[PDB]
C-alpha cells in the first residue's frame, strides 16, 4: 500500500491542502508554515502548478507580511526577504537589503519565527534523531545530484555554485537565489519539448524525495 506514485499523489494532496490553507488564511502564518509554503512553491514550480492560484495564496501571504509591515514584491522576493530576515536574527547577520524598514515588534515576529523554528528544530532532532534524518537527507540527495552530474547531458553546474546545503538542517542557511536558479533551469527544461527517461526519472526522484524529505523535516514534533 502506497508506493512512490501514491506518495507523489499524497505530496500533491498535502501541498494543495497546504496551498488551500494559505489561500484560506488571511491572517498569521507560522515559520514552519512559511517555509512549508516555500517548499510548496519549491516543488510546485517544477510540478508546473496554477501560477495564479499560487499567486493568490501568495498574495494572502504578502497581505499578512505587509499587514505587520513587511514589504515584498511577490512571494519569491518576500520569502527571500524573510529568509534573510530570519537568519538575520538567528545568526546575528546584518541586513543585506530588504527594501522595507523594520521595527522592533517586526523583529520580535522574526524572533518567533527564528526561535519557533529553533525549537521545532531540536524537538524533531531529538524525537526523530536529527543527525540521523539529516544523514538520510544528505545521502539520498547526494545520490540524486551525483547521478545528475554523472549523467549527460546535464544542465546543472559544478561545486562552485552548489556550495550550499541543498538539504540543510531544519533551520540552517540555504541559498534560495542560487537554488531558484538551478530549479528554474529544471523548470525551464521541464517546460521544454525534450522528454528524457532516466534523467527525468532522476528529476522526479529528486522532486519527490526532496518533497517527502522536507515534509518530514518540517513535520511538528516528528509527526502526530
Task: List, in order, residues 6 or more apart from 159 with CB less than 8 Å away.
Answer: none
Whether the link from the prior residue into 86 is cis, omega within 30° of 0, is: no
Residue 74 carries which DSSP code? Answer: S
Residue whose grid cell is 539520498: 140
Domain ranges across the chain? 1-224
Give the residue ranges of DSSP H helices in the chain: 4-24, 31-46, 51-68, 75-91, 104-127, 130-150, 176-190, 198-217
> Which of 80, 69, 48, 92 minimizes the C-alpha distance to 189?
48
53-82 per-residue burial string, b: 16 or more CB within 10 A, e: under 16 = ebeebbbbbbebbeeeebebeebbebbbbb
| Residue 160 CB neighbours (<10 A) | 6
Note whether 139 and 145 are within 8 A (CB).
Answer: no
Stated as kind and residue range, the H or E segment containing 80 is helix 75-91
CA dist 151 → 98, 132, 180 (Å): 39, 28, 21
Residue whose grid cell is 519557533: 116
Q: How far is CA 27 from the centre of its chain?
A: 21
Amino acid at each position: 500500500v502506497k508506493t512512490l506514485d501514491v506518495l507523489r499523489g499524497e505530496l500533491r494532496g498535502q501541498r494543495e491542502a497546504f496551498l488551500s490553507e494559505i489561500i484560506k488564511s488571511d491572517g498569521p502564518f507560522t515559520i514552519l508554515q512559511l517555509v512549508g509554503y516555500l517548499r510548496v512553491v519549491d516543488t510546485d514550480l517544477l510540478l508546473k502548478v496554477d501560477s495564479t492560484k499560487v499567486d493568490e495564496a501568495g498574495k494572502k501571504v504578502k497581505a499578512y507580511l505587509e499587514k505587520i509591515g513587511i514589504r515584498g514584491d511577490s512571494v519569491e522576493a518576500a520569502l527571500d526577504n524573510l529568509m534573510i530576515k530570519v537568519y538575520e536574527i538567528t545568526k546575528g547577520t546584518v541586513e543585506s537589503s530588504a527594501q522595507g524598514t523594520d521595527s522592533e515588534e517586526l523583529k520580535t515576529l522574526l524572533l518567533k519565527f527564528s526561535e519557533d523554528l529553533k525549537a521545532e528544530q531540536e524537538l524533531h532532532s531529538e524525537a526523530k534523531g536529527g543527525e540521523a534524518l539529516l544523514s538520510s537527507m544528505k545521502t539520498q540527495h547526494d545520490e540524486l545530484l551525483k547521478k545528475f552530474a554523472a549523467l549527460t547531458p546535464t544542465f546543472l553546474t559544478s561545486e562552485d555554485i552548489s556550495g550550499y546545503l541543498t538539504v540543510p538542517e531544519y533551520g540552517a542557511p540555504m541559498n534560495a537565489a542560487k537554488w531558484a536558479k538551478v530549479e528554474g533551469m529544471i523548470h525551464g527544461k521541464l517546460e521544454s519539448s525534450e522528454v528524457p527517461a532516466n534523467l527525468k526519472a532522476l528529476v522526479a526522484e529528486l522532486i519527490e524525495l526532496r518533497a517527502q524529505m522536507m515534509a518530514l523535516l518540517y513535520g511538528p514534533i516528528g509527526h502526530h
